[PDB]
């Protein structure tokens, strides 16, 4: 069985699928806005070994007034407890490094795969970011 | 300068203060329950200054997830947005939960402030001992005996 990763954030799943390649299975589940989960979400969550999440630095109230803390590490400390818009290239690169680091940490047996997939993906992301490329896109077809 | 830690949950701050002792400073700030304009107070602005670690609750504590995905309560959860600058984007069970929280808070402080690892480990042990003592099942029935 492949290593299994889930997230509630669709674009994290998109990026993680490119870092994971064939080394891990990445699935997204739906976070209710507001209920009952679909059988597909039951199946997608089954066997998850890692959850990838956005942190406080992406909550609007916090990002508006605590920007200086955007790089502060945030650690989930509830593990085991049982209770009673546009994506800039710069941000995509940071996400990919963080996703790579998490997959390397929790699935060290595939570290080299994750590191090289991330490097390849980052290389494509920068190629897409070239400002000259954006200008040449404005040229209409003959 | 003491290592500085923040959280948005008072109970995490309380537990973290016991684990941190004199080695780290722990402050909490208020998170609104989505609010259009939520302005920080000056007190929260100052409490968050110089924060070096944020302690968070995970998906396993969201009501919808805790109910339907109980089997995932122990699955690790990692924040991967760090550095993103968004330009564009049953008293016995409570005690068992406290013990788990304390271990996780200890582990986080040991990781991010390793110079004080032993202090965090011993403070965590002392605090866990108090939690176990408070929740000892052998004490609970005798506690019911009415006072004079």
From TrEMBL, chain A:
Residues annotated as transmembrane: none
At the top level, the lineage of the source is: Bacteria
Quote the subcellular location field of this record: Cell envelope
Family of this protein:
Belongs to the bacterial solute-binding protein 9 family.
| Name assigned to this protein | Fur regulated Salmonella iron transporter
Q: Which organism's genome codes for this protein?
A: Salmonella typhimurium (strain LT2 / SGSC1412 / ATCC 700720)
Higher taxonomy: Bacteria, Pseudomonadati, Pseudomonadota, Gammaproteobacteria, Enterobacterales
Q: Which gene encodes it?
A: sitA
| Whole-protein residues included | 28 to 187 of 305
């Amino acid at each position: 069985e492949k290593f299994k990763v889930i997230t509630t954030f669709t674009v994290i799943a998109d990026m993680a699928k490119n870092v994971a390649g064939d080394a891990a299975e990445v699935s997204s589940i739906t976070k209710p806005g507001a209920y009952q989960p679909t059988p597909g979400d039951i199946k997608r969550a089954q066997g998850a070994q890692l959850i990838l999440a956005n942190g406080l630095n992406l909550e609007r109230w916090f990002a508006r007034f605590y920007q200086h803390l955007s790089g502060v590490p945030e650690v989930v400390v509830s593990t085991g407890v049982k209770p009673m818009a546009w994506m800039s290239a710069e941000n995509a690169l940071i996400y990919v490094d963080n996703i790579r680091d998490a997959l390397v940490k929790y699935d060290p047996d595939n570290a080299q795969i994750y590191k090289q997939n991330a490097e390849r993906y980052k290389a494509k992301i920068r190629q897409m970011a070239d400002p000259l490329r954006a200008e040449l896109e404005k040229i209409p077809a003959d």
